Each structure stands twice: as structure tokens, then as C-alpha cells.
Amino acid sequence: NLYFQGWQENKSWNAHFTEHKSQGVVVLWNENKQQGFTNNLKRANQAFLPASTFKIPNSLIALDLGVVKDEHQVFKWDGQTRDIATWNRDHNLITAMKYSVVPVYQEFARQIGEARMSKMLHAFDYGNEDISGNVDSFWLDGGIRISATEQISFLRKLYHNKLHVSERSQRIVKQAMLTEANGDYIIRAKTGYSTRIEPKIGWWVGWVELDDNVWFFAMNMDMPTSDGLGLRQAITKEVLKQEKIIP
Template sequence: MNVLALFILSLVSITLYAEENKIEALYKLKNINGSILIESDDGKVKHNYNVNDNERFIPASTFKIPNTLIILEEGLIQDQSETIQWDGQEREYAPWNKDQTLKSAFQYSCVWCYQHFAKQVGDQKYRQYLQIFDYGNHLTGSDVTRFWLDGELRTSVNDQISFLRKVYAERLPVKKAHIKTLKSIMLSEEHNSYKVWSKTGWSGKDGWFVGYLVINKQVWYFANHIEINQNSDLKFRKSLTMEALKVLDIIPPKH
């Protein structure tokens, strides 16, 4: 390797180190333990903080991303506006206590809605989909209605982004129309200069915010996992991600 190449490599390393320090400062300021990975679509730019490739966590409601595709592919619901009839059971989270659609169930992280469909999918089918999707550790557990909440399914920040890439590129063994439906209900923010497709998740101490954004025709994937020690920590799943995207100059600081 010549001197110029070594110099350029050195500059890149210094820049990445400085940017990781900025992200670390955000987490320490909020007293949050976590890890985040942000990648460009071409894979040439990767920003990470505290990422351990061997560390996997319960996916919680981020599993609604593949689960939505499974439900659609199995023909258990036809589109995002079809009614999912409320079972009449009162739950602590008021938005769940009414009829839902696939769109509202996704956006409100309606656990009972997806549990209703999980019973119909069944464990064997889930295991097959986890294999062909190459999602997480491919495991379910003893309860088909809870394996993504407190069962054996685990995923890492790298796993999350790997799957999001397949979603964005529509490279999954399901009908393209189902992926487009998923993308429609994943769209969470629309600004003048960029859009965000995302999903939060929470189970026990595992908190997530994962997704991708498109800005100036460039795609960036993100996966943020944080330790939830109290309910007030939940807001940092998203806020730390968005702040990290700003300090990295991926999105404008004013947003």
C-alpha cells in the first residue's frame, strides 16, 4: 500500500473515530446503555457505537416487520385497511381497545392483533419463514403467541439491518405486493427533504428503534437497541437515533 493510500485510510479512521465519539456522548449524556448501527445503502459507510456482533436481543415489536409479511403471505388478511375485530377485552393501552386495521395494529404495536394471527400461522410455519427470511436466530419457543416477546427468538442490530435491506430492495420470497403494503404502513415520517420508515419495540429491558430513511435519493439503514430501566427511557429509542443521524450530518440539524 502506497503512502497516499495509507494517508487516506488514516484520515478515514480518524473521522470515523470522531463521529463514534459524538454518538457515544449522546448516550452518556442521557445515561443510556445501548448500541446503534447506521449504514449507507451501498455499505461503504458504517457508523456504529458499542456494537457487539455476537450480542442478540429479544426483537419485541420490531418483529412486526417480518410478521406482517408472513400474515399477508398466508392470506390471513388481505390489505392494510381490512378490519381486525376487537375481542372486547379491555387492555391497559387505550388505542388497543377497539377494532383495528393492519395499519393501525402496526403503528400502535397492537400485541393482541398479531397474537390473533400467530395462532393461525402456527409454530411450524413460523420456523419455516424464519429460515427462508434468515431472520435472527430462527428460533421460536413454547408459546407461538409470545416467542418474539419472551420466547427464544433473538436478533442483533446487524441482523435487523440485514433484514431491512431485503425489505427495501424487495428481495424476500413473498409477493412484491405484500412488501409494498408493509412499506406503506412502515412509513412514519415525511419531511420536505427526507422520509423515514420505522418500527419501535419493547419487551422487558430490550428497547428498539429500527428502520431506514431516504434523503436526497440516498438510503440509510439504522438499528438502535437500548436498555430500558424505567418507562422514561422509552423515548430514547427514537430520539437518540434521530440525534445520531443529525450529528453525523445525514439529516439536517433543524429537524
């Protein structure tokens, strides 16, 4: 039988959003204490399109089915010129995730296919597990929905290698999730920006590795234009600093 004390609501963190003239939620989970904290318990449980944060489960499935052989395999540019310059080149899994290269992952989705994608998402217990829409864009404008607290749940399984895919697939995706590391912490995370369907939100989900603990985080925020995308990380780090998790 699972046990859970509940999410504590700390409305103090709301200052970090209002002082940036913004609206959103940050959710934190203390792995050692098995305690969760948020500034907004309702928005914490509100489900949105995952957008580019779907690259995490998408990468795991592609690797586990052999669609992606390893983190060095090159997915060559299809020659279509797109709005994001870094997309108009060849990529491997590391760089495709760092530059959030959508057309590489849509190709992953097509090769995975509807049937296996649905079955894997059910095995992951991922969000609402609904892939209705185009096989290669349902996480951008289809039926799939996931909340900040469901993101923590999924990430916790990935951290402990508990997802129903190979340990190796999971190690590879956690490698590709690497975002920042120094003498004080490691951050493995994925950004996201949902623009195709309202409301337009930005995501940042992942976790902070310390010497003797892991803090999982999931945040999203209203994002009416791309000028505020940097706030996804800045607001989260302000909360991490306030709680003395990072210096």
C-alpha cells in the same frame, strides 16, 4: 461472492447515550457506500428478543399467506380491556402497527401457526430463526434472538423487495412502516419495548430515505422503565443530525 469492508466503530456517538444517562447502541448503514457504522461493535452484534419489532416479519408472513388480505381489513377488538387504551378498539394493519397492537399480531401468529412461522423465518434468515415458546408470544418471551446488525440485514432485503414473499406483501409492510415524512426525508421504522425477560431494552429499527440514498438504522438501549421510551427516537435522531443525514 459477497464483499464487506466491515463496521467502523465511532465511539463519538456514545456522548448521545451518556448525556441522557443511558446505555445502548446505534447502528447505521450507508446503502450507497455499502458502509456500516456503530458506537459499540459488540453490542451491535448482541442478540435480544425482537419484541414489537417482530411486527415487521410477522406482518409480511401474514400478508403473504392471506391471513391478512390487505391494509384495510379490520381486525375487530376481542372485547378484553388491556392496559394500552389504543389497543381497545378495532384496527387495520396500518393502525395495528402504528399503535403496536400486540393482540392483533398474536392472532396473526396463531393463524400462521408454528410450522409456517418457522419456515418463513428460516427463509428470511431472521436472527437465530428459533421460534421455541408459545406460538403467539415467542418474540416476547421465547427463544427468538436478533442483533442490531441482523436487523439491518433483514431490513435491507425488505427495502429491495428481496425477501422470499410477494413484492406486494413487502410494499404493504413498508407502507405500514411509514413513520415520518417531510420535504427532507422519509422514515420507515418500527419501535419495540422488551419487558417480559431481562434485560429490559427498547428498540428502534428502520431506515431513512433521502433523495439519492438510504440510511438504514437499528438501535437498542437499556430501558429500565417506560419513562425513557422517547429516547429511542431522540438518540437516533441526534446521531442522524450529527452525521448530517437529517437537517
